């Protein structure tokens, strides 16, 4: 049928469609089911339709958004604020609540309005791509570099507002973050920091102002449309040198991990952001599933090991990037190669030693920890046919038995929902995300249900172990938020009080973080 | 006379009182005049007196806090949250609103809950001073050290709270505080981050937890009294050296700012928080002000150069330290006396070679640099008879023009109010804080006036040339925030919904930043 917003009529709808239209123009609203499809999540989770988008809208100024907002308050449309939309694994540009409308900001948002040479940061609006960016720093022969994640389309701005990680010194987005304009609930703009006082030049240097520091408030939030964000980019170093470290057994994760920690805390010698990569995610980079194993079941050891063999790879593959002059990379290199070498099996490549099949991912690593963003991992979409992953991210001390207690649990219900379990250790200072992607085919029903099942029991297993993740998926939203119960769910009943002040009509992305205004609450979503 | 909360009887006072000393012991709860002196203003601003107590008490659970918060809110008592109250420069410890009952929770609840050697965190109660936190690490022969502010008599968690900053690499300490614990404006307690799911080990280890990330809002701020916060703690370096840099002209702060920026931005050389300190700074540090001038006025040309002359220190004195091992900290030197050295009449002294007693502050800042906290910069307070501080502290552009238009703007209005003009330019990585005290006779209300009078003009002409400050005294809180008016006072509204959401009472701090409750909104307070 045609999608609806809760509660609003064919009537209503119309209404506010044409007063959309009459703000950023005809052209810039999209309302018919054929256009509409391209903004389902396009790695769909569960059987039923989830997560339906009414309609698009795709303004060109602050004050485009305000309207937009002050409209949709009138109508009680909610509003689905996106970048670039491209959040895949944790539902694209779909809202969380079927039937809201999309305002894709990215796509005529998109001026990179400052890079600053002299103090190292930039201006950007949603639209700004890491691509967008990357060919601006290099036409205009840049000292400064970006951080980006894995998938160079995002938005600067899309990825920091959902608390995405890059794995350069700078990986910490939000931490980088200074400075941003954002659209109130019901329709009043306000800038924070130094942007909070009328011509400073301060607003990207500085990033705390005067008084309670919101910008935080805005991040996995549904407490604003956010129309520019301030970001510091790091001066290039002058040389660096990537190097892989394969590791052959199941259960080396533990030293890795032990021995890891000491190496990354001081950010000496592990300068960049680590990661420790599975066989089963490196595989899935570089080859088809059915190249190991041709049959339906979770893969035999034996099959594990051609990957292995034939890739060059361990079952564990560690990735890092060094910085500075030659002298200091050698010396650091030097400690990381004496470090590692105590466990048995261990193998060290560098970016120019490797360029066989196996070393793809070390290339691509390569790139991503220099600034350079890449799209090369979207091949991990061809494990399967209409590949496509969820993102169950646990957050884990750097510790090799915690790391490892997390390993066996999850691979243990991968293999009982017929899933391959990839892993990736993305490793902080003091703490470690455990990137669990599920590649699984989108236009099979029964992947689609198994994965969502699945997923739902590792939310609550992890919980009941004492681990959370830092970022989840529209359908685990209500799920994770729950697990963050302590003091009888103080936190969630301390979101939902600010989302109620600021927002008293509930219009922006009800449901977001499993944060819903209270005319939602208790409707069976 | 008694003092009263604002529209509270004696009767329904007493009655409070009474039932706070059910909750935390009789001798807990200070209510008379004699005892309340020492909780006032150490260095009051303006001739009328202001900012009085009314009771302080002193919970030690926060449990107690809880229930205390709960009597606050049936009686309608203000209650004013401190940890150890060693706010001198902004209050101390009395509050923004007369009347208010102070919450001394560092008076009891003062335990080190954690301090970890592996992952380098601490978990502390509010009541754990530097000096505290030290001695534990000394006594454990911990390999970590601390981050203390210049004086090491306050509260690791207090001073976080008022955003305050050291001048290690872990200056900024709400950047690394990690988890906490808050009691929101109507008794309930709450946990952030990772500490809001039950039975993580990651509370200290990953600040973010899961949604919207609000442990800044607790920063400056009004909505809730903190019980338990974590900080990571950085690992002492195997050497360090600390330096001071004389420049002879005040003329001088243009070059030594625009060659600084190159030096800090990648923090090498310059791994420290440099500090930027003028000959009357320095001065005060180790002499009183009729050692160079018995006069009244502004203190003339030959004098400045007798406080020169005779301490061997510049208009102008700056103050690093460098750590890791000894051939490293040779090269930063290295490179930080030529390209600093291009300053005619600069002049290089590290803390091996100078014991004289304008040596006495090289000596200091290399103790507060290496994690040491110190006392010895209360001398500054002997600069002038029963002398006091107030804070006037600009954010600025890492630019010499900046500082330079700054520097020329708060010196002629000190001239102007007959107070000395006292500078420490505090180097973020892309912004400075401005650190402009000014010491007084806290015993004459002319001079107290003239504070208060010169402050307030200073924030509005600082304003007028688009500069904000980063925290501010009990007197400018409402002048501060009214400058931060971009969007029509976007910010302060923003700041007041949630206020009133997580506050109906209006119970906790009112007028905090210059944030009041509905019920003293238009009030004359
Ligand atoms: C499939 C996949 C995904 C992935 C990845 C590898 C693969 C194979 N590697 C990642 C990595 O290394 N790091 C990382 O952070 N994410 C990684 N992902 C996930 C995803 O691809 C990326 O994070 C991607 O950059 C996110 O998409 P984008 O940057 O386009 O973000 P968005 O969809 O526009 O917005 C994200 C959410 O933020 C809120 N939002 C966005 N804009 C606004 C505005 N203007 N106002 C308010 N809120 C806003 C919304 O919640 C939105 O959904
Ligand atoms: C006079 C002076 C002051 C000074 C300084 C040098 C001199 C000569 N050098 C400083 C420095 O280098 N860095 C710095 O940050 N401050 C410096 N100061 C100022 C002062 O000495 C310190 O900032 C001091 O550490 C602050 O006092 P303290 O640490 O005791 O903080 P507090 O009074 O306990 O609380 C501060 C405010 O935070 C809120 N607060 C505090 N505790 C709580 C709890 N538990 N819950 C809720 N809110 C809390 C209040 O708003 C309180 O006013
Ligand atoms: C190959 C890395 C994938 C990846 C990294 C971080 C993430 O948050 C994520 O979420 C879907 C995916
Ligand atoms: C002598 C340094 C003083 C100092 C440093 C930081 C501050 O915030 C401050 O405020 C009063 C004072």
Redesign the interface.
């Known amino acids: 049928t045609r999608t609806l917003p809760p509660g609003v009529s064919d009537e209503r709808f119309d209404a506010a469609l044409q007063r959309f239209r009459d703000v950023v123009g005809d052209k810039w609203v999209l309302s018919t089911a054929d256009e509409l499809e391209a903004f389902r999540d396009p790695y769909p989770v569960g059987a039923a339709e989830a997560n339906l988008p009414s309609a698009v809208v795709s303004p060109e100024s602050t004050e485009q958004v305000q309207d937009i907002v002050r409209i949709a308050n009138e109508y009680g449309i909610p509003l689905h604020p996106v970048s670039t939309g491209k959040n895949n694994g944790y539902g694209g540009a779909a809202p969380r609540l079927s039937g809201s409308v999309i305002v894709k900001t990215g796509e005529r948002m998109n001026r990179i309005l400052e890079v600053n040479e002299?103090?190292?940061?930039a201006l950007l609006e949603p639209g700004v791509t890491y691509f967008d960016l990357y060919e601006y720093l290099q036409s205009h022969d840049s000292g400064l570099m970006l951080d980006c994640p894995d998938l160079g389309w995002g938005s600067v701005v899309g990825n920091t507002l959902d608390?995405g990680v890059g794995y350069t010194p700078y990986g910490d987005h939000?931490?980088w973050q200074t400075g941003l304009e954002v659209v109130?609930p019901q329709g009043?703009?306000?800038?924070?920091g130094?942007?909070?006082?009328?011509?400073?030049?301060?607003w990207?240097?500085?990033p705390?102002?005067?008084?309670?520091?919101?910008?935080?408030?805005?991040?996995?939030?549904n407490?604003g449309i956010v129309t520019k964000m301030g970001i510091?980019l790091m001066?290039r170093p002058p040389a660096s040198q990537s190097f892989l470290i394969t590791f052959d057994k199941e259960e080396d994760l533990e030293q890795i991990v032990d021995i890891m920690?000491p190496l990354r805390?001081?950010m000496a010698p592990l300068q960049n952001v680590p990661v420790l990569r599975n066989i089963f995610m490196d595989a899935a980079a570089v080859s088809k599933r059915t190249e190991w194993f041709d049959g339906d079941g979770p893969m035999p050891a034996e099959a594990i090991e051609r990957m292995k063999k034939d890739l060059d790879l361990g079952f564990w593959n560690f990735y890092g990037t060094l910085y500075g002059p030659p002298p200091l990379i050698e010396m650091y290199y030097g400690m990381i190669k004496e470090a590692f070498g105590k466990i048995p099996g261990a193998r060290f490549f560098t970016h120019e030693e490797r360029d066989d099949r196996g070393g793809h991912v070390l290339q691509d690593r390569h790139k991503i920890n220099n600034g350079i963003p890449s799209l090369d991992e979207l091949q991990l979409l061809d494990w399967v046919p209409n590949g496509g992953h969820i993102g169950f991210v646990p957050?884990?001390?750097?510790d090799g038995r915690?790391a490892m207690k997390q390993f066996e649990m999850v691979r243990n219900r991968a293999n009982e929902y017929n899933k391959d379990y990839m892993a990736q250790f993305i490793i902080?200072?003091?703490?470690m995300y455990h990137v669990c992607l599920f590649i699984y085919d989108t236009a099979d029903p029964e992947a689609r249900e198994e994965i969502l099942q699945m997923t739902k029991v590792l939310v609550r297993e992890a919980?009941e172990?004492?681990?959370?993740?830092?970022?989840?998926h529209n359908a685990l939203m209500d799920d994770?938020?729950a697990?963050?119960?302590?003091?009888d769910g103080?936190?969630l009943?301390?979101?939902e009080?600010?989302k109620?002040?600021?927002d008293p009509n509930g219009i922006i992305a009800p449901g977001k973080?499993?944060?819903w205004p209270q005319r939602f609450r208790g409707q069976n979503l």
């Open positions: 002299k103090y190292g940061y608390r939000f931490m109130l009043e703009v306000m800038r924070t130094m942007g909070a006082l009328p011509g400073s030049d301060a990207q240097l500085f705390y102002g005067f008084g309670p520091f919101p910008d935080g408030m805005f991040t996995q939030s407490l510091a001066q920690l805390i001081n957050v884990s001390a750097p915690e902080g200072l003091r703490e919980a172990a004492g681990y959370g993740e830092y970022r989840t994770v938020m697990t963050f119960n302590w003091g103080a936190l009943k301390f979101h009080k600010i109620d002040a600021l973080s499993g944060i």
